[PDB]
Design a protein around this ligand. Structure first.
Ligand SMILES: Cc1sc2c(c1C)C(c1ccc(Cl)cc1)=N[C@@H](CC(=O)NCCCCCCCCNC(=O)COc1cccc3c1C(=O)N([C@H]1CCC(=O)NC1=O)C3=O)c1nnc(C)n1-2
Ligand SMILES: [Zn+2]
Lengths: 127, 375, 808
């Protein structure tokens, strides 16, 4: 049927802060993956209506994309780095789950996940 | 229309494919009518024309291994001209010789970007898919039928000393009157043999092409009728069936005649899916690249689009915001363009980033979405 | 699978070359003439010419020169063919037996090389030191004339000058020297080289390069004591010899382009020159060194392809556009100012551009009426068997098409005449021709051009001539519209109309239009000595061909084939159209089968569906090659002539096995004719239980006429084996393989001849001796008509070949 609402990105009752790990995840990691060649399918939620994928949100119970993560970082939604890392991994895992091994988009997600992981090993300690 | 300060050498370079590729200067050509066993790239769906530059981006491990094997050998693969794309039926094709490659590390996966160029037409004798999943093609090289002058068999010996020649319409009148004199020995006049003369056809094509590209024919256009005909066919925005019929032609004379008939008849370019929605006309065609108005480019996912540059376009909706990422024409931002009626993707609207550029905006329409139409 | 038989009914009459020398004897003056595949040898007498030997060769004579190397009693003859067969021959006679023995022979064709634009050029060094061949651009082939080179081995020398117009071996040089006119981006120049056999290379010439006229075309090697070379262009005659440079620019030669020359005096004092308009000039050299050059207009002859001075002021003029001539040159001009008096005229049928078959005199006795010649040499020729009686009707203009109308006792002939721009405004003819001297004439009325006219440039005027069949008087001459070219001509009845009409298709040809987009179909009725226009129809293209199709009119307009019905109101009404992938140049018919043909050998076979009122594609073939004429032999066989003087035959399979294969025309017959066929037409010249089925006459460019017929399988097999056995025994002039000569040969492919029986080779069986006949028939038993294997004797095959000869 129709698409669900996208994940929330701002909460006025949620506290905001600027930790060193999250500012690194914003200025380096998400900036590295966002300008990447294969980034565009993950820059926004999956439009299951336009893609004619009626079972996507029946299988993917935890949708996630890089646009949501970007907006969550900019709005200081995260309290810690593990939140954003788990969002990235949820995105990649959803992509692997719904599709099949060897699909073009699976290879693209694998590329972006490899780049994310090699970037994440340089995570700075908090200030 | 307007004027241009764009430098048409940047489109041909395919700068969007990363840094300076490792370029090859060698050339491999197979003898006519000979048979060769050539690998076929799986995801290639284009009807490649000899002389046409083909860019590709491959990230499947099988494709990368095959490209490495080709780089270590003769650097030539087969591009099947599919008559039926769904069932992978191919009777004709064109060879492509890799002249630049680049494997990119510090990338999520191993990806290889390649600039190749079509070389020789061929007939598909046999297609056999190997155990690896990649398929090989036993292939017969189709020769280029170069016919002698139509007056060579009827030429008077005493007039042999007058067949070498030292306001263009008067010059062409004198040319027709001097070259095809012995036509009075046949059942046909001179102006009929002019309709099968390579140079006359080439000059008429040169006019019809001066319409689009302002580059002088003194250097940009070839003198050989075969090379000229292939260059013209590589930039003619026609559908796949017409392109296959044009590829089947072996004689450069027939090729030039068919191309001129297409250029005279075909006037409107409509949506292939709609068949009844005019997108552009022949008059708005203009060349932003050295290769002509239409050239093959590759998107970030290996898909190949034969983009045709036009000044104006009608009956299109614009989807999304402009973007400079992976732009085929540097300094321009593209915007997805769909048909107004069927919403099918027709191409992109390119807009200039600097306010000093010219033209400030144009349309790149993919050939696969267009259909030629005569009123 | 073809089973066809082609024979020559008239040998080529056109002349492509002529020389004089001492070939039969050192005391005799011999004249040698080349007629494509014929060599004629006469002895020059005080009366005129005495024929001594006519031979045939398995090739097309492209180079014919006489030369006598030091050590021979009389001259030897060098001959190169179109297929690059070179041979040196000697004349031999003992008693009455005359044999043309082959002193040397060989193929000089290179493995690679582009045949040049100026065609094959062949020259011989004066001291008989070498033979220079110019076949491909940038390569000069040298055949050294040693006594050991019986295979005519040769070596190539690189040419920095890639575009050579003409070349000659110079006289009075210590080393064999060539002088040639070439063209480069700087213009046209003359340059000399020396040929080194020791080095097999080029050395600097005796005199340096000079820039010549932009249209310098002819080079003449002037013999001693003069030496040097004369260069002839369109406006100037120059002479070069070391420090000697002498140029003249006589205006009298500016009217037409000189195309041939011949030496009169042995020392090079006088030369004959002939232009394209048939004018004959005398070039006089004034004396150790040259003093001046002079050009005097002697007169007008036939449009000369070659000239040769005999003796006592008698000159032979070999023409391909008209009748050849023997003319006399007098010292004093006549009352009209011409020094030329015609002594004898030899018939030339070439070129035959169209023809038809009519039972003129006796019923059942077929006669062939052909359009021959061009320009002032154009004519009609009436040919009937007696070998062949030929009547000539000169037209003085260029005929193109012809058809017969029995109910009016007259022929319709399409013709064209050349005119030049008037001093004021309009056009003016060069000479009175058939269209300007008719008993009655008319012009068409316009019912449908920027940058008008120019300075005295030629324009074509097209006319339909109604010509009586008994007297051949031009009864009427109807002129067509301005810038209108007449293409097709048909005489027929249509619909329920009992009147017989002359139907003409035309095309509006303008210089800016590369392809005509406007044309007419005009329907005349001839009655009571005046031609009236009955109907006029406008079409959007050129009417390339028309055919009467079951009381209707089938017409080809550019890429379209249309069918018109003749209405009761006497108008042309379209019934159906077929839009083809090619432009329909050739249209032939048989029953409901239509044959559509393109200039590049694109063939299409359609069928008219009467119950549907539309055409249906039956078959097609798309093998590109320059065509020339097409014809339908039967319901399944289609004959055609194409590039490099070849014939082919395609077949269809009506029933067949696969709808994809039912649409293909199989190439089942190939043959190398050696002639450029211009017209096919059914008919025969023999008075009407025969091994052959059908009869198709064809007319060619060199005047040759031939006949093609169909055979059965057993007859074809017997005749093919007869051909093999005859080639095994017959001695060939120049020792040329018959299979090599008849092989379908273009510069892109060479295949053996299939499905064709050389009628001339089989007819030559009756001219050999009885022992050779018994040799050929020996151990035959190739008769598979009864079912088994019947033996054959000499007399059986004698009777067979006699019955085969009785078809033409
Ligand atoms: C939005 C999402 S989310 C998501 C997916 C998508 C599309 C996918 C998916 C599949 C394949 C690929 Cl490759 C990528 C993603 N798959 C689903 C599951 C599914 O339904 N799969 C079925 C197959 C769908 C094939 C659809 C393939 C895409 C079709 N358009 C093109 O490729 C061409 O247009 C593009 C796209 C991007 C960039 C450019 C172009 C382009 O033309 N140019 C030009 C412009 C001009 C210029 O100057 N230069 C250029 O280069 C670009 O720059 C799924 N699963 N998980 C997730 C997540 N996804
Ligand atoms: Zn559409």
């Amino acid at each position: 049927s129709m698409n669900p609402p996208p994940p929330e990105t701002s909460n006025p009752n949620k506290p905001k802060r600027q930790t060193n790990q999250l500012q690194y995840l914003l200025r380096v990691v998400l900036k590295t993956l966002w300008k990447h060649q294969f980034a565009w399918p993950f820059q926004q939620p999956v439009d299951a209506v336009k893609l004619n994928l009626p079972d996507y949100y029946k299988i993917i119970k935890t949708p996630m994309d890089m646009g949501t993560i970007k907006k969550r970082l900019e709005n200081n939604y995260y309290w810690n780095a593990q939140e954003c890392i788990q969002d990235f991994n949820t995105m990649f895992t959803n992509c692997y789950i719904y599709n099949k091994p060897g699909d073009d988009i699976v290879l693209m997600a694998e590329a972006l996940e490899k780049l994310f992981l090699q970037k994440i090993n340089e995570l700075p300690t908090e200030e | 229309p307007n004027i241009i300060n764009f430098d048409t050498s940047l489109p041909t370079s395919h700068t969007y494919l990363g840094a300076d590729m490792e370029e090859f200067h060698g050339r491999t050509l197979h003898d006519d009518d000979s048979c060769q066993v050539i690998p076929v790239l799986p995801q290639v769906m284009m009807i490649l024309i000899p002389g046409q530059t083909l860019p590709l981006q491959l990230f499947h491990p099988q494709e990368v291994s095959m490209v490495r094997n080709l780089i270590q050998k003769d650097r030539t693969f087969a591009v099947l001209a599919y008559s039926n794309v769904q069932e992978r039926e191919a009777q004709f094709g064109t060879t492509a010789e890799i002249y630049a490659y680049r494997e990119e590390q510090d990338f999520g996966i191993e990806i290889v970007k390649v600039k190749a160029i079509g070389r020789q037409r061929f007939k598909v004798l046999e297609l056999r898919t190997q155990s690896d999943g990649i398929q090989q093609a036993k292939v017969q090289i189709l020769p280029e039928c170069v016919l002698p002058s139509t007056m060579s068999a009827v030429q008077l010996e005493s007039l042999n000393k007058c067949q070498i020649f030292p306001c263009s319409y008067k010059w062409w009148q004198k040319y027709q009157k001097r070259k095809f004199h012995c036509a009075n020995l046949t059942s046909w006049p001179r102006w009929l043999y002019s309709l099968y003369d390579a140079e006359t056809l080439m000059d008429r094509i040169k006019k019809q092409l001066r319409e689009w590209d302002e580059n002088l024919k003194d250097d940009s256009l070839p003198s050989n009728p075969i090379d000229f005909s292939y260059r013209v066919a590589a930039c003619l925005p026609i559908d796949d069936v017409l392109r296959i019929q044009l590829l089947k032609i072996g004689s450069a004379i027939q090729r030039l005649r068919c191309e001129l008939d297409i250029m005279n008849k075909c006037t409107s370019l409509c949506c292939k899916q709609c068949q009844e929605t005019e997108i552009t006309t022949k008059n708005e065609i203009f060349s932003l690249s050295l290769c002509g108005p239409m050239a093959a480019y590759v998107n970030p996912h290996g898909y190949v689009h034969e983009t045709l540059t036009v000044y104006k376009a009608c009956n299109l909706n614009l989807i999304g915001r402009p973007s400079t990422e992976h732009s085929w024409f540097p300094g321009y931002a593209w915007t997805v363009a769909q048909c107004k009626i069927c919403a099918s993707h027709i191409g992109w609207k390119f807009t200039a980033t600097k306010k000093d550029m010219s033209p400030q905006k144009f349309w790149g329409l993919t050939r696969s979405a267009l259909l030629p139409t005569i009123p | 699978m073809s089973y066809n038989y082609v024979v020559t009914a008239q040998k080529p009459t056109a002349v492509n070359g002529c020389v004089t020398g001492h070939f039969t004897s050192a005391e005799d003056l011999n004249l040698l003439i080349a007629k494509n595949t014929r060599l004629e040898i006469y002895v020059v007498t005080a009366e005129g010419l005495r024929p001594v030997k006519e031979v045939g060769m398995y090739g097309k004579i492209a180079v014919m020169e006489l030369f006598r190397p030091k050590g021979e009693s009389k001259d030897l003859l060098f001959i190169l063919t179109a297929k690059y067969n070179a041979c040196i021959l000697e004349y031999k006679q003992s008693g009455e037996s005359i044999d043309i023995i082959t002193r040397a022979h060989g193929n000089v064709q290179d493995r690679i090389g582009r045949p040049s634009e100026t065609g094959i050029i062949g020259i011989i060094d004066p001291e008989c030191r070498m033979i220079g061949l110019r076949l491909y651009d940038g390569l000069f082939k040298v055949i050294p004339l040693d006594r050991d080179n019986k295979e005519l081995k040769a070596f190539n020398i690189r040419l920095e000058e890639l575009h050579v117009i003409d070349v000659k071996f110079l006289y009075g040089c210590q080393a064999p020297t060539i002088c040639f006119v070439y063209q480069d981006p700087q213009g046209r120049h003359v340059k000399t080289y020396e040929v080194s056999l020791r080095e097999k290379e080029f050395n600097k010439g005796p005199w340096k390069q000079e820039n010549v006229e932009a249209e310098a075309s002819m080079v003449i090697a002037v013999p001693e004591p003069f030496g040097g070379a004369i260069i002839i262009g369109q406006e100037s005659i120059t002479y070069h010899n070391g420090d000697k440079y002498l140029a003249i620019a006589p205006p009298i030669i500016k009217q037409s382009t000189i195309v041939c020359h011949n030496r009169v005096d042995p020392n090079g004092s006088r030369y004959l020159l002939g232009d394209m308009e048939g004018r004959l000039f005398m070039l006089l050299l004034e004396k150790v060194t040259l003093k001046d050059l002079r050009v005097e207009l002697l007169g007008e002859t036939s449009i000369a392809e070659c000239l040769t001075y005999l003796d006592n002021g008698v000159v032979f003029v070999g023409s391909r556009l008209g009748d050849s001539q023997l003319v006399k040159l007098n010292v004093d001009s006549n009352e009209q100012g011409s020094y030329v008096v015609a002594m004898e005229t030899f018939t030339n049928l070439g070129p035959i551009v169209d023809m038809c078959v009519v039972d003129l005199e006796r019923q059942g006795q077929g006669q062939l009426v052909t359009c021959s010649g061009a320009f002032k040499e154009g004519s009609l020729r009436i040919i009937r068997n007696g070998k062949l009686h030929i009547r000539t009707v000169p037209l003085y203009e260029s005929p193109r098409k012809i058809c017969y109308q029995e109910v009016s006792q007259c022929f319709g002939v399409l013709s064209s005449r050349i005119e030049v721009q008037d001093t004021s405004g309009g056009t003016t003819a060069l000479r009175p021709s058939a269209s300007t001297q008719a008993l009655s004439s008319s012009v068409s009325s316009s019912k449908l051009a920027p940058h008008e006219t120019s300075f005295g440039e030629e324009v074509e005027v097209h006319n339909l001539l109604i010509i009586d069949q008994h007297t051949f008087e031009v009864l009427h001459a109807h002129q067509f519209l301005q810038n209108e070219y007449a293409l097709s001509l048909v005489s027929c009845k249509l619909g329920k109309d009992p009147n017989t009409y002359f139907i003409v298709g035309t095309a509006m040809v303008y210089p800016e239009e590369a392809e005509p987009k406007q044309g007419r179909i005009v329907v005349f009725q001839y009655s009571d000595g005046k031609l009236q226009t009955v109907a006029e129809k406008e079409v959007k293209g050129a009417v390339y061909s028309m055919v009467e199709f079951n009381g209707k009119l089938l017409a080809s307009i550019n890429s379209t084939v249309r069918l018109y019905e003749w209405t009761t109101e006497k108008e042309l009404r379209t019934e159906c159209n077929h839009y083809n992938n090619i432009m329909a140049l050739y249209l032939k018919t048989k029953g409901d089968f239509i044959l559509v043909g393109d200039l590049m050998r694109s063939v299409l076979l359609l069928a008219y569906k009467p119950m549907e009122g539309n055409f249906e594609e039956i078959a097609r073939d798309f093998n590109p090659n320059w065509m020339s004429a097409v014809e339908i032999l039967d319901d399944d066989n289609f004959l055609g002539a194409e590039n490099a003087f070849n014939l082919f035959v395609c077949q269809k399979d009506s029933a067949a096995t696969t709808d994809e294969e039912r649409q293909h025309l199989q190439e089942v017959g190939l043959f190398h004719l050696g002639e450029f066929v211009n017209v096919f037409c059914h008919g025969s010249l023999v008075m009407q239980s025969t091994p052959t089925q059908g009869s198709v006459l064809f007319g060619t460019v060199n005047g040759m006429i031939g006949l093609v017929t169909s055979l059965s399988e057993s007859w074809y097999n017997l005749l093919l084996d007869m051909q093999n056995r005859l080639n095994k025994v017959i001695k060939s002039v120049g020792k040329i393989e018959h299979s090599f000569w008849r092989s379908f040969h273009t510069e892109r492919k060479t295949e053996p001849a299939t499905g064709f029986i050389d009628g001339d080779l089989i007819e030559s069986f009756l001219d050999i001796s009885r022992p050779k006949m018994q040799e050929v028939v020996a151990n035959l038993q190739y008769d598979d008509g009864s079912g088994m294997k019947r033996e054959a004797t000499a007399d059986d095959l004698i009777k067979v070949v006699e019955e085969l000869t009785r078809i033409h």
